[PDB]
Amino acid sequence: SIMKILLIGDVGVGKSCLLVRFVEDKFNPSFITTIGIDFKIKTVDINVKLQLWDTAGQERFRTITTAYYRGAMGIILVYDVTDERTFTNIKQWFKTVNEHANDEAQLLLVGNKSDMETRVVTADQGEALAKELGIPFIESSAKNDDNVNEIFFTLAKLIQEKIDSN
Amino acid sequence: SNYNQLKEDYNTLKRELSDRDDEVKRLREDIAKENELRTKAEEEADKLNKEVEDLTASLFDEANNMVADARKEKYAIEILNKRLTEQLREK
Amino acid sequence: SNYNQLKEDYNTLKRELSDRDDEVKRLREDIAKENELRTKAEEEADKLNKEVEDLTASLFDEANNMVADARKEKYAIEILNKRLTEQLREK
Ligand SMILES: Nc1nc2c(ncn2[C@@H]2O[C@H](COP(=O)(O)OP(=O)(O)O)[C@@H](O)[C@H]2O)c(=O)[nH]1
C-alpha cells in the first residue's frame, strides 16, 4: 500500500542526516555523496509503505531527479535555522515545485537543526513563510531526534486523508 | 523565334507544371508521414519520462540491498570475532 | 484566335505554376518545422537514456566498490578469527 515522498532543499541543510535518522538502518549505504541520489523504504503503521528520495540536486541527473517531482505524493521543503539564506531560498523552490509537482500531491515545510543554536530564524518567523503558501509546518533536530518521526508521520496522514476525499 | 518558340515554350511550361503539381501532391504525403514520426517520438519522450522513477527506484533497491547483505555478513563475523576474542579472554 | 487562345492559356498555366512554386516553398518550411519538433523529441530521449546509462554504470560500479570493501575487511577478520580458534584448541 505505497506512498511516494521526496525531500527538497540546499546542500548543508541536513537532509541526508534526517533520512538516515528517520529510517534506522545502519547497513544501508550512502550514495548521496558519490552519485548524488539515495532512495529508502520505511514501512510505518498508520492504523502503508513509504518510499523516499533524497538528492544533491546537481545538474548531472537533473532530468531524472525531475521525474521524482512528477510522481511524488508528498514533498518536504526543508530549511536550516542556523542558515538565513536557506530560510529565504524557499519560494524559488516552491515555484520550482509546482511547475513540476503533480497538482494534488501534498507539501510540508521543515525547519531543521533546531539543535545547533546560532539559530537565525524563530518558529513564528517560520510559520510566517508557511502561512502564505497554504502548507503545514514543523521544525526538528536531525541530530537529537526531535520531531523527526513526526515530520513523516504527519505528512502521510494528510495524504491518506486526501485519497479518500474522492 | 517565334510561333514555334511559343508552341514549344507552352509545352515546356506544361511539363514544368506537372512536375510541380506532383511534387506538391508528394510533399503533402511527406508531411503526414513526418507527422506520424513526430507524434510517435513525442509519445516516446513522454513514455520514458513517466516510466523512469520506477525504473530508477529499482536500481537503488538492488544497489542498497547488495551492499546491505554484504555489510551484514561482514558484521556478523565481527560478532564472531568478538565472541571468541572473549571466549579466550576470561579463560 | 488560336494564337490568342494559346497566349492566354500560357498565361493561365504560368500562374497555375507560380502557385505551386509557392505551395512547394511553404510545404518545405512546414516539414522542416515538423522535423524541428521531431528532432527535439529524439533530442531529449537521448539526453535521458544518456543519464540513465550513466547512472546505471556508476551506481553499480559504486555498490560493488563498497561491496569489495565489505568483503575485503570481512576476510581480514576471518583470518584473525582462525588464528583465535587455533588457540582455543590449545587450552
Ligand atoms: N547541528 C546539527 N547538524 C546537523 C543536523 N542535521 C544535519 N546536520 C549536519 O549538517 C551537515 C550537512 O547535512 P546533510 O544531511 O549532509 O545535508 P543535505 O545536503 O541537505 O542532506 C552535516 O555535517 C550534518 O551532520 C542537526 O539537526 N543539527
Author numbering:
A (entry chain A): 19 to 65, 69 to 187
B (entry chain B), C (entry chain C): 50 to 140
Can you quote the paper on this entry?
Sec4p is among the 11 Rab GTPases identified in S. cerevisiae and acts on the surface of membranes to regulate transport between the Golgi apparatus and the plasma membrane. To complete the cycle, the protein is reactivated by switching the guanine nucleotide state from GDP to GTP in a process stimulated by guanine nucleotide exchange factors (GEFs). In this work we have investigated the nucleotide exchange mechanism of the Rab GTPase Sec4p and how its GEF Sec2p stimulates nucleotide dissociation, making use of the Sec4p mutant S29V corresponding to Gly12 in Ras proteins.
As seen in the other two structures of the complex Sec4p.Sec2p the average temperature factor is very high (66.8 Å2) which reflects the high flexibility of the complex. Superposition with previously solved structures of the complex Sec4p.Sec2p reveals that Sec4pV29.GDP.Sec2p shares high similarity with the Sec4p.Sec2p complex bound to phosphate with a RMSD between the 353 Cα atoms of 0.675 Å. However, due to the presence of the guanine ring the loop β6-α5 adopts a conformation that resembles the Sec4p.GDP and Sec4p.GTP structures. When the superposition between Sec4pV29.GDP.Sec2p and Sec4p.Phosphate.Sec2p structures is performed using only the Cα atoms of the Sec4p binding site of Sec2p (residues 100–120), it is clear that the mutant active site is in a more closed conformation than the wild type. Both the P-loop and the nucleotide are shifted in about 1 Å towards the SWI region in the V29 structure. We can predict that this difference would make magnesium rebinding to the intermediate state of the complex more difficult and together with the increase in the affinity for the nucleotide it could explain why the GDP bound state of Sec4pV29 can form a stable complex with Sec2p.
